[PDB]
Design a protein around this ligand. Structure first.
Ligand code: NAD
Ligand code: NAD
Lengths: 336, 336
């Protein structure tokens, strides 16, 4: 049971609001779309099909009522263009900002474009929302902002030095968010995601994330590469926690805003152990090389989510095993 | 005597290099131009006449040899456009990045534009320079990055929270500079200026800085406004120190790079005392209301320059009194 969360969703189903999801055709944004439409919300969506997909929107349309779908106004556009940002704010209540170019290697090779989308694009949305005078503003931040801090698990007040352009942009989101509270009194909630996985995470690409990259390879029968000695660990977080954490935040009490919160489960799984779980779970539906680490790669990563639990009444109900199990079917359909 | 500085300038007069000054029509940039051309350097200049002036370039042309001037290639352009940034890097040895929109109030009202120039513009130049593989890279940072830290004087390792969009952009310059060291091995030197004053500082404008704002008013005979109880203090720094600090840095030894340095004198003058010195010095060439503080205004400000003195052999030779005295004549000519 996710109790506060249940309570919040009930409220919404009755007094429906207008939401704006940027990066709505992406993995996390499309997940949020699914959930919000099922709660009969009015949604305005923004994506520029950089890393997002029209097919992700399509799939969502097959998962929801057609009266539910009628409430979605999709917009093909760029958060990089301030004018778009403003047209799309009209009448919005809650903002869920997910639009950004992710990935550490990507920023390392083209920082200019990453900067433009993640900082210029972020500030645009943030400003537009301030002026539109929305009721809440929740944005995607990154566990990467911890950088070289050696503490495990990671606690929000203690970050170190950023180790890549990507980490910087995300840190810069937070800093801007704070200054906006100081100078306009406009209160946000930033979520430091930690390695989210689940349905509709792109397994194709040079920047494919690990769980969907391995899963696709274990099916095609291709090699499975482990970038390093295979001891690196992470706090893998199923989408349903992230979806939960977004809603808790959009409707959070004012004293909880202007805050940064880790979004994860509190556990730690190794690149070796993961390969275990991904296989065990895939052969229950009937179907390993080593290399160097990456430049900018992180050694150990585990979150402390007590802040979330405390102030927002968060409930990480789905740990990694179950999460993989709820996921693999989606990748079979998608990979046939 | 400025001994290491003297030593450096001799070297240059012999093995002249190609320099790039952004914000070269501005106050600090035009001052750097004057100095570099007098040392027979080759200078490529970039400004977009946002806050800079063609007349500032003109004045410089009357202060220097015409063989000296022939070595200046001026370019009307924007650091916001990456392509410009690259054409201008061709063959450059030392970069002196001064192009930015200054002022705390200005960022508070239009953060989007401030963001674009100070971060996007900064990143462009920094990237361009990395690829061009220059020999040095020195950029204008801000004492504002101390934010809400209560220590006096201020010491580079200890900063607090930024209190305005402006402060954020400048802080973000530093962070980027560092990450560039980590990830490409490209070593910079950031200078945290502290309230620079001297010849060619625009006394006109809503955002005019204090010393030229008061000086122009004391001549026109207008009122002189003191934003607050007139106890606020600052470390006023004459340009010749900042000019000195830029050169020390461009030619600094590699172990001194990837560092941030305060640029100031170490002293502290009050808004009440300043009004004293500006008058005493102006009536020796023959010619007060109170209001509220500013939002984002700072209470006390004094730098610790020992790091500069240690690692770069800096010498703050000109304190405030003398500096005002060297300045007032320029404002008479300019204000007739
Ligand atoms: N996935 C993670 O582990 C993780 C970690 C930290 C932060 N985040 C943030 O989560 C958010 C979503 O991540 P994701 O994995 O779902 O990524 P994703 O690429 O799947 O989703 C990104 C979406 O961004 C949109 N987009 C990108 N740039 C845009 C622009 N300029 N204008 C309009 N739309 C644009 C596209 O429609 C795309 O669908 C991103 O902010 C990501 O940085 C994710
Ligand atoms: N003047 C000071 O006391 C002080 C204090 C702190 C920091 N600084 C920093 O020092 C640098 C110069 O200071 P200043 O007082 O001479 O300011 P300034 O206004 O005199 O100089 C700014 C110059 O940059 C140019 N510029 C602005 N945006 C540009 C763009 N997008 N592309 C190209 N050129 C652009 C302007 O035309 C102007 O010539 C700035 O980065 C400023 O932030 C100055």
């Amino acid at each position: 049971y996710m109790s506060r969360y249940e309570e919040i969703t009930q409220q919404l189903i009755f007094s429906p609001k207008t939401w704006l999801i940027t990066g709505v055709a992406g993995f996390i944004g499309s997940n949020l779309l699914e959930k919000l439409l099922k709660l009969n919300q009015v949604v305005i969506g923004l994506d520029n099909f950089s890393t997002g997909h029209q097919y992700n929107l399509d799939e969502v349309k097959t998962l929801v009522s057609t009266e539910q779908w009628s409430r979605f106004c999709f917009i093909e556009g760029d958060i990089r263009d301030l004018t778009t940002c403003e047209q799309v704010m009209k009448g919005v209540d809650h903002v869920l900002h997910q639009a950004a170019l992710g990935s550490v290697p990507r920023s390392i090779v083209d920082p200019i474009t990453t900067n433009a989308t993640n900082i210029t694009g972020f500030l645009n949305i943030l400003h537009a929302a301030k002026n539109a005078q929305v009721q809440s503003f929740t944005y995607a931040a990154s566990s990467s902002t911890y950088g070289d801090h050696p503490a495990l698990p990671k606690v929000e007040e203690n970050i170190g030095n950023p180790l890549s352009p990507y980490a910087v942009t995300k840190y810069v989101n937070e800093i801007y968010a704070q200054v906006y509270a100081r100078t306009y009194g406009f209160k946000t909630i930033g979520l430091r995601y930690f390695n989210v996985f689940g349905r509709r995470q792109d397994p194709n690409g040079a920047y494919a994330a690990v769980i969907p990259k391995w899963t696709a390879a274990m099916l095609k029968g291709d090699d499975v590469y482990i970038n390093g000695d295979g001891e690196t660990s992470r706090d893998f977080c199923y989408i349903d926690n992230v979806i939960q954490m977004n809603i808790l935040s959009a409707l959070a009490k004012d004293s909880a805003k202007d805050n940064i919160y880790n979004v994860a489960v509190g556990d730690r799984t190794t690149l070796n152990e993961l390969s275990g779980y991904i296989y065990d779970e895939l052969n229950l539906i009937h179907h390993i090389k080593y290399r160097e680490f990456r430049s900018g790669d992180v050694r150990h990563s585990q979150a402390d989510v007590t802040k979330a639990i405390d102030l927002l009444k968060y409930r990480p109900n789905i740990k990694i095993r179950e999460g993989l199990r709820l996921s693999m079917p989606w990748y079979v359909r998608f990979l046939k």
